[PDB]
Amino acid sequence: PLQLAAKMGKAEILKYILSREIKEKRLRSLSRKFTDWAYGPVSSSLYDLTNVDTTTDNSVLEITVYNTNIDNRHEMLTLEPLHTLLHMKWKKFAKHMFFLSFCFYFFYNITLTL
Amino acid sequence: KESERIWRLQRARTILEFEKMLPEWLRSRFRMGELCKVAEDDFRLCLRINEVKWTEWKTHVSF
Amino acid sequence: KKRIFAAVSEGCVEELVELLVELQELCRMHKLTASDTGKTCLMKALLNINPNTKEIVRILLAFAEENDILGRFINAEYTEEAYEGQTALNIAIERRQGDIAALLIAAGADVNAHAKGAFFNPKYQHEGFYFGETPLALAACTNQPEIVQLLMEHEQTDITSRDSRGNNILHALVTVAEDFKTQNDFVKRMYDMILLRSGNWELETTRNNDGLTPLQLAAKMGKAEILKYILSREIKEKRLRSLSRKFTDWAYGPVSSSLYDLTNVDTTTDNSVLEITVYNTNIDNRHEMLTLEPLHTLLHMKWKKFAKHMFFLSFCFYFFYNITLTLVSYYRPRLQLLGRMFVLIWAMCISVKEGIAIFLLRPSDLQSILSDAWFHFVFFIQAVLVILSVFLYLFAYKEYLACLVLAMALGWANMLYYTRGFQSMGMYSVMIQKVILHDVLKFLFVYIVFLLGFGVALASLIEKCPKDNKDCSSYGSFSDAVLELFKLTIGLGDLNIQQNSKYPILFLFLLITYVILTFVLLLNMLIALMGETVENVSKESERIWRLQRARTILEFEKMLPEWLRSRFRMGELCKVAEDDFRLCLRINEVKWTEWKTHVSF
Amino acid sequence: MGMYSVMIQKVILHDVLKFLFVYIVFLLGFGVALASLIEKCPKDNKDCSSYGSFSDAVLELFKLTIGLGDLNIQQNSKYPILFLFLLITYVILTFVLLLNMLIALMGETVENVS
Numbered sequence: 062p063l064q065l066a067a068k069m070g071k072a073e074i075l076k077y078i079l080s081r082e083i084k085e086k087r088l089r090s091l092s093r094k095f096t097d098w099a100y101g102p103v104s105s106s107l108y109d110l111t112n113v114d115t116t117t118d119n120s121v122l123e124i125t126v127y128n129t130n131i132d133n134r135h136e137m138l139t140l141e142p143l144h145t146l147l148h149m150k151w152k153k154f155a156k157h158m159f160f161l162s163f164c165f166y167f168f169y170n171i172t173l174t175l
Numbered sequence: 176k177e178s179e180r181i182w183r184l185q186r187a188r189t190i191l192e193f194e195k196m197l198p199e200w201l202r203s204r205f206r207m208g209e210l211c212k213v214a215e216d217d218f219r220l221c222l223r224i225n226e227v228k229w230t231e232w233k234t235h236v237s238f
Numbered sequence: 239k240k241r242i243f244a245a246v247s248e249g250c251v252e253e254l255v256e257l258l259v260e261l262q263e264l265c266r267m268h269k270l271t272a273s274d275t276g277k278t279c280l281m282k283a284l285l286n287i288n289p290n291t292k293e294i295v296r297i298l299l300a301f302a303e304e305n306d307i308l309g310r311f312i313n314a315e316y317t318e319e320a321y322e323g324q325t326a327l328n329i330a331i332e333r334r335q336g337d338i339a340a341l342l343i344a345a346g347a348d349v350n351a352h353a354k355g356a357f358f359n360p361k362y363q364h365e366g367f368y369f370g371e372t373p374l375a376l377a378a379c380t381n382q383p384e385i386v387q388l389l390m391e392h393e394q395t396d397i398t399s400r401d402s403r404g405n406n407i408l409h410a411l412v413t414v415a416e417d418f419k420t421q422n423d424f425v426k427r428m429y430d431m432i433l434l435r436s437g438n439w440e441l442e443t444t445r446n447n448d449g450l451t452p453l454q455l456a457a458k459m460g461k462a463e464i465l466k467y468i469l470s471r472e473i474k475e476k477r478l479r480s481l482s483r484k485f486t487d488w489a490y491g492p493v494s495s496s497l498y499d500l501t502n503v504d505t506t507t508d509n510s511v512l513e514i515t516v517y518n519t520n521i522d523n524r525h526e527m528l529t530l531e532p533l534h535t536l537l538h539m540k541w542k543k544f545a546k547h548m549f550f551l552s553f554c555f556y557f558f559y560n561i562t563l564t565l566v567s568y569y570r571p572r573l574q575l576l577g578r579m580f581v582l583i584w585a586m587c588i589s590v591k592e593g594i595a596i597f598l599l600r601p602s603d604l605q606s607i608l609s610d611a612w613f614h615f616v617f618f619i620q621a622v623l624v625i626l627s628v629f630l631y632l633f634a635y636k637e638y639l640a641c642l643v644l645a646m647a648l649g650w651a652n653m654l655y656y657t658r659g660f661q662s663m664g665m666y667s668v669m670i671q672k673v674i675l676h677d678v679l680k681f682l683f684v685y686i687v688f689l690l691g692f693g694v695a696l697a698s699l700i701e702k703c704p705k706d707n708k709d710c711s712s713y714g715s716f717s718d719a720v721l722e723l724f725k726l727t728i729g730l731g732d733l734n735i736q737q738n739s740k741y742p743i744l745f746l747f748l749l750i751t752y753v754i755l756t757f758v759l760l761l762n763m764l765i766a767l768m769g770e771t772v773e774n775v776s777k778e779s780e781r782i783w784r785l786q787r788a789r790t791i792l793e794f795e796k797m798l799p800e801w802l803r804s805r806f807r808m809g810e811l812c813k814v815a816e817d818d819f820r821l822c823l824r825i826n827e828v829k830w831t832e833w834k835t836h837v838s839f
Numbered sequence: 840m841g842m843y844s845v846m847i848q849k850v851i852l853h854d855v856l857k858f859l860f861v862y863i864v865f866l867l868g869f870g871v872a873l874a875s876l877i878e879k880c881p882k883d884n885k886d887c888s889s890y891g892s893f894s895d896a897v898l899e900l901f902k903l904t905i906g907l908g909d910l911n912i913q914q915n916s917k918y919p920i921l922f923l924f925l926l927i928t929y930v931i932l933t934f935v936l937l938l939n940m941l942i943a944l945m946g947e948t949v950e951n952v953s
């Protein structure tokens with residue numbers, strides 16, 4: 062149902078499931094977000110990436126990034142567990158490699174011109 | 176006001192494409208380790224997030 | 239040890255009443271804390287306020303006072319590299335719990351406990367939470383009126399206490415405000431309540447470690463509503479009349495005579511509020527803050543008394559210098575040496591005047607090269623061009639003509655800086671400086687990419703002419719092809735066919751593709767970009783022009799010498815009745831709309 | 840047609856005049872620079888230079904402002920690179936900046952005027 066809500070385009074259901082916090086001890090296992098500590102305006106949320114990170118098959122991030130044809134894939138991509146995942150993925154890698162690809166293509170194009 | 180969505184989605188698709196380009200041995204850049212809070216085999220693989228909401232806190236504390 | 243922690247984590251009262259019966263029997267110093275970060279069970283009970291919170295902390299403090307340790311570890315220290323300064327009272331006040339905080343205060347806690355830490359003193363706003371690092375300022379920051387009344391109505395509450403940053407309570411209240419009013423602001427009313435309840439003037443005279451009062455701090459940080467409240471703070475009570483800045487001398491229907499205070503507002507002291515609010519454009523909120531009455535009338539009357547005749551004098555001097563620079567080159571031999579020396583004297587004067595300015599500026603104002611920093615560069619370049627061209631003129635060189643021609647071509651285009659006097663042309667000039675750096679640069683980069691890509695393709699498509707006279711090909715090099723493509727980009731011609739190219743169809747196809755990409759795509763979407771930009775700019779450029787004129791007024795004020803700065807404001811009040819140290823300003827302002835609305839109901 | 844006529848009388852006095860003043864400033868500044876850049880012709884027949892006076896340079900700059908021509912190079916100028924650079928700068932400032940923001944100004948004016 063998580064991947065189905067991401068693929069079909071239901072933004073509010075995906076937002077609710079990805080940030081589902083239950084404070085009851087009996088139903089704590091049915092949760093994905095845990096607040097480690099809260100201090101005024103700051104908060105330490107422990108989000109769950111069981112099927113969200115693109116390490117499994119047909120992950121939620123890959124599903125929500127490769128289905129542009131429904132057009133609702135930015136208000137859905139701006140959700141916290143996806144937005145911070147893409148941002149930190151872009152910080153750790155996929156940015157030095159993007160500049161490396163640009164440098165290789167620039168050298169190839171200038172040596173094709175010369 | 177709409178092209179910002181398309182540029183952000185294009186950059187996200189570029190990030191995912193570069194992620195898929197990496198080999199299996201180089202994909203050791205995974206997320207935070209186990210919770211240990213599940214207390215049943217600790218099969219979870221979570222992510223630490225320290226997010227700030229100054230506007231939401233100001234509105235909540237105002238009332 | 240962990241049993242008590244598990245008891246306080248989820249509020250297991252029965253577990254703790256069993257533990258306080260079992261533990262002390264084995265006891266007959268007690269390391270009840272976590273022994274690694276200093277987190278005692280008091281905090282661990284108080285981060286998560288479970289429904290059973292009163293009795294558990296009550297019996298815990300009863301066990302503490304039974305062992306004669308209640309007065310020892312009540313001010314427990316969260317000794318960790320991030321916090322390093324937390325106590326039980328701080329967490330109790332934060333968690334919106336006043337009863338427990340009242341019980342802790344009655345039992346005896348550290349009222350003035352500095353919570354000095356790296357997380358508590360963030361480098362930026364988003365890095366952490368800053369609340370003044372004191373329980374009193376924390377109670378005032380997190381909208382807790384009952385708790386801050388309890389904290390202030392105490393004996394050893396150090397109200398005039400400054401934390402590691404040197405911030406007072408009012409500095410902390412300023413730093414936690416908002417640039418725009420949310421219509422439900424509590425920091426302003428808590429500032430008001432704290433000011434009236436305690437402190438006369440030393441509470442607001444205390445300076446930050448940066449050297450700022452709460453007034454200057456509110457002006458620098460960008461808090462417009464707090465600055466508006468302080469600059470127009472009127473108290474009608476005789477006991478608290480001294481804590482006021484605006485006094486209404488007389489009111490007559492819609493007109494009013496407000497006696498505003500300029501103790502630290504006029505730019506006669508060091509780091510004044512007017513200079514602070516006019517030299518910090520990078521926060522962008524410096525026109526709705528500059529439009530406040532004690533600043534707006536100050537800038538207007540400063541512009542009336544001076545800084546307007548001097549602006550016209552500067553324009554006249556630059557106009558005469560530019561016209562006598564033009565007439566020297568145009569009337570040059572292929573009697574009038576006074577002009578030929580006036581250019582040298584004025585170029586040297588403006589060169590050193592721009593050199594000291596180029597050395598005294600900060601790198602912060604160079605962002606987006608909009609905050610009156612580009613014009614200094616162009617003025618300095620023109621000045622150095624004139625003197626260097628004169629230097630090569632005296633040395634009997636040859637390159638003096640090129641430098642002097644560029645100098646006078648730059649000088650006539652530099653007269654657009656002096657158009658700030660008029661509002662209608664000021665809008666046009668600020669639009670010039672905005673669109674050249676926002677939309678024209680991107681189009682220029684894209685078109686340059688499309689130029690040097692098609693330029694080398696057409697240049698490499700055609701070989702040399704059979705006669706080798708370089709006339710039958712019209713594209714014999716890269717520079718020639720670049721110029722010939724740009725000429726047809728303008729629309730002048732030279733797009734005909736049969737240019738000795740071995741592939742006339744491909745050459746024609748590339749020319750048509752370049753024509754489409756430039757004339758139909760880039761030259762048209764440039765229209766799109768500014769067209770969308772101006773609809774947002776036409777109501778925003780007024781702020782930039784007014785701020786530029788205000789910065790010009792302040793710069794001309796700083797230019798005046800000490801003896802000529804006798805144009806100060808109105809004299810002493812004599813109403814303070816204590817040494818009459820005030821230096822106020824008479825203001826007769828009219829509010830017909832406000833009076834009509836007030837009298838209508 | 841009354842709407843068209845009142846729009847004529849409004850925009851000529853509101854937007855066209857400011858653009859005309861700015862462009863005239865940019866014309867007589869570049870006009871004397873290019874006129875002073877080139878000396879007299881060696882044959883002294885006033886045909887190899889094409890910029891022999893201020894009025895000639897003003898007319899020849901305005902002609903290429905319209906888009907008629909006469910922007911070619913090697914006009915007997917002692918500094919052909921500087922002359923070309925000044926011509927390109929004038930072309931940018933007129934065709935790309937002033938002629939385009941004039942479009943911006945009436946474009947914003949008419950939405951309030953109509």
Ligand SMILES: C=C[C@](C)(O)CCC=C(C)C
Binds near residue numbers: 616644647651652932
């Ligand atoms: C307004 C400042 C400008 C646009 O850089 C003028 C440039 C003119 C030259 C270099 C001759």
